[PDB]
Amino acid sequence: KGTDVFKADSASIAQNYTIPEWFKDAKFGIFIHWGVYSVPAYGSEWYSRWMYKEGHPINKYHVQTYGPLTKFGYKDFIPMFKAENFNADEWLAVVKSSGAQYIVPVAEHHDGFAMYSSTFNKWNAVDMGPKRDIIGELKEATKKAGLRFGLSSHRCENAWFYEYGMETPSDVQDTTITLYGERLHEPEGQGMTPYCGKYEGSNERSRRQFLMHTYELIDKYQPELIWFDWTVGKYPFQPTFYKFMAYYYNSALDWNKEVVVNTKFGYGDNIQVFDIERGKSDRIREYPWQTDTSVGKKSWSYCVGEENKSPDHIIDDFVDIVSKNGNLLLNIGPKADGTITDEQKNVLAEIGKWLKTNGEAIYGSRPWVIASEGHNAGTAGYMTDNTKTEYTADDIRFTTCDNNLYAVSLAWTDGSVTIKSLATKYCRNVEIESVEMLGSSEKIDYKMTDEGLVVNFPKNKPTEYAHVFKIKLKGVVVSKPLYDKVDNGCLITVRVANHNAEDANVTLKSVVDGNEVSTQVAVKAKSEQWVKMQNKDVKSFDDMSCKFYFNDNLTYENEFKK
Ligand SMILES: OC[C@@H]1O[C@@H](O)[C@@H](O)[C@H](O)[C@@H]1O
Ligand SMILES: [Ca+2]
Numbered sequence: 001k002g003t004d005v006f007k008a009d010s011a012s013i014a015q016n017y018t019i020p021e022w023f024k025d026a027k028f029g030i031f032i033h034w035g036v037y038s039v040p041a042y043g044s045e046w047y048s049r050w051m052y053k054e055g056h057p058i059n060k061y062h063v064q065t066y067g068p069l070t071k072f073g074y075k076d077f078i079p080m081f082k083a084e085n086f087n088a089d090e091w092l093a094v095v096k097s098s099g100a101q102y103i104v105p106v107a108e109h110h111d112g113f114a115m116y117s118s119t120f121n122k123w124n125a126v127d128m129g130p131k132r133d134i135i136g137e138l139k140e141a142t143k144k145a146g147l148r149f150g151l152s153s154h155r156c157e158n159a160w161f162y163e164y165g166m167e168t169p170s171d172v173q174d175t176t177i178t179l180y181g182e183r184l185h186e187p188e189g190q191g192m193t194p195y196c197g198k199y200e201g202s203n204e205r206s207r208r209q210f211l212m213h214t215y216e217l218i219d220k221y222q223p224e225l226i227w228f229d230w231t232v233g234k235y236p237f238q239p240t241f242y243k244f245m246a247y248y249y250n251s252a253l254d255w256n257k258e259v260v261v262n263t264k265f266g267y268g269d270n271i272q273v274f275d276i277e278r279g280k281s282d283r284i285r286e287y288p289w290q291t292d293t294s295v296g297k298k299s300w301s302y303c304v305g306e307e308n309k310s311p312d313h314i315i316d317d318f319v320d321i322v323s324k325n326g327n328l329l330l331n332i333g334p335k336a337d338g339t340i341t342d343e344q345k346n347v348l349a350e351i352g353k354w355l356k357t358n359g360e361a362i363y364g365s366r367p368w369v370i371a372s373e374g375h376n377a378g379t380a381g382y383m384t385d386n387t388k389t390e391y392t393a394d395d396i397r398f399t400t401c402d403n404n405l406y407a408v409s410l411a412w413t414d415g416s417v418t419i420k421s422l423a424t425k426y427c428r429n430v431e432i433e434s435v436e437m438l439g440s441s442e443k444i445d446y447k448m449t450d451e452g453l454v455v456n457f458p459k460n461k462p463t464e465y466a467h468v469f470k471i472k473l474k475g476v477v478v479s480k481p482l483y484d485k486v487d488n489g490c491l492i493t494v495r496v497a498n499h500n501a502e503d504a505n506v507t508l509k510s511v512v513d514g515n516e517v518s519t520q521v522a523v524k525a526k527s528e529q530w531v532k533m534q535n536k537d538v539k540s541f542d543d544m545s546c547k548f549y550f551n552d553n554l555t556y557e558n559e560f561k562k
Pocket of ligand 2: 312316391410411465466
């Protein structure tokens with residue numbers, strides 16, 4: 001078509017790409033790991049890699065259960081992947097009942113098997129296994145369901161996923177079998193780092209095939225979101241990935257659709273949507289991001305003996321995620337025959353029921369001045385979210401929408417909470433106009449005090465898990481300051497919300513070690529903004545004396561040591 005607004009570099013993409021509003025408004029999507037690995041249903045979806053590692057538990061399990069590596073390899077699961085009870089409409093009904101707004105089936109995982117109608121990859125679900133275009137059928141059901149269709153690609157790791165099959169007698173050593181990839185060594189680098197060391201993680205043919213892979217996905221299914229696994233960020237792969245990004249963003253312009261890319265590291269927060277695997281953020285992040293996590297604690301694909309999270313665990317993390325500008329991409333793992341388990345069906349249905357009542361606080365919302373208050377901050381970071389926090393009613397998460405304030409208690413109480421973030425020191429002319437709990441017909445009795453807004457819970461729980469107060473208020477509110485260390489100084493970050501219908505001007509003052517920095521800020525009516533300040537010539541960050549002022553009212557001082 002010739003559309004070439006986007007060139008294959010980060011400056012070009014940053015000049016013209018904007019994370020779309022639909023992703024910020026959507027908040028919630030369903031991930032679905034399903035493939036050949038679902039047949040053995042043992043360990044996890046990494047079965048293909050570990051079965052060829054002689055001595056590994058999965059290897060020893062496979063030899064006894066299915067046979068030696070030379071007689072029964074991973075490819076030999078494919079005839080057993082018949083998917084006799086797969087029905088795209090049934091999957092979409094479950095996703096829709098969860099309240100999710102977009103769906104991300106796995107188009108191809110690490111194992112080499114394309115779950116779509118591929119041209120270059122003969123190991124695909126149209127010619128083999130299910131003998132149907134799983135991705136295509138899901139795309140169709142998604143459109144009828146009225147949701148947005150995405151998909152994930154994990155093919156970058158296929159270059160090295162089968163490396164151990166070269167080090168022991170196996171069918172992987174037959175290099176004419178393209179399913180098993182380039183058989184390279186795993187790239188070096190611990191965790192979410194672009195460093196690859198002595199093993200690049202890809203080669204010329206795998207990069208060429210990656211582009212063939214993404215191009216046909218783009219061209220055939222026009223997904224509104226493409227999610228990529230961690231290795232696309234390794235340094236030797238980045239030129240190839242930027243080629244993909246420009247082609248996707250250019251194609252999207254032709255579609256009159258705005259699209260989303262997910263990576264876990266290696267690319268700027270502003271040119272794609274940052275994603276954290278099995279973990280969330282501890283702070284409000286400037287740019288929209290995504291937690292992708294599984295209902296199963298052990299695995300993404302179905303495996304016998306999976307320990308599924310509770311709805312309370314997931315919904316508490318969900319609210320925490322949304323309060324910090326994040327989306328939740330929640331994974332289910334259906335049985336090999338195409339059946340979503342009843343436990344994971346129940347988890348999604350419970351979330352959907354909660355969202356039916358409390359969705360006004362979630363859909364279309366944005367972070368407030370501060371995401372959370374209370375004693376229990378919760379988990380944060382890569383591979384931390386299997387731990388469940390024991391929240392109280394005092395653990396509160398905030399969102400905002402249409403100038404309304406939503407304060408979500410992560411547990412119940414027969415008494416009252418006090419919203420400390422509305423304490424008088426953070427406020428200027430804050431007047432509470434109304435308080436209600438979503439889904440409750442009981443008039444909420446509340447009282448503004450110097451320590452914050454005291455709110456008494458109603459008699460009856462509208463829902464379990466989490467409970468939402470909708471607050472209409474005027475006035476200006478500032479967050480407590482966040483201090484970050486830099487060279488010879490410190491960075492101060494607050495957020496200010498003007499809930500008034502009139503424009504407001506606001507003065508913030510940071511006094512650090514005698515150095516006084518001030519900024520006057522014009523905040524339009526019914527708006528909020530970041531305010532970053534810097535105190536320089538600070539000789540010791542650990543020994544700082546700090547005072548912060550909101551229009552000459554003391555908001556914070558670090559009166560206590562270290
Ligand atoms: O975020 C999803 C997860 O990403 C990677 O860790 C994969 O190796 C794993 O199988 C799963 O897909
Ligand atoms: Ca809870």
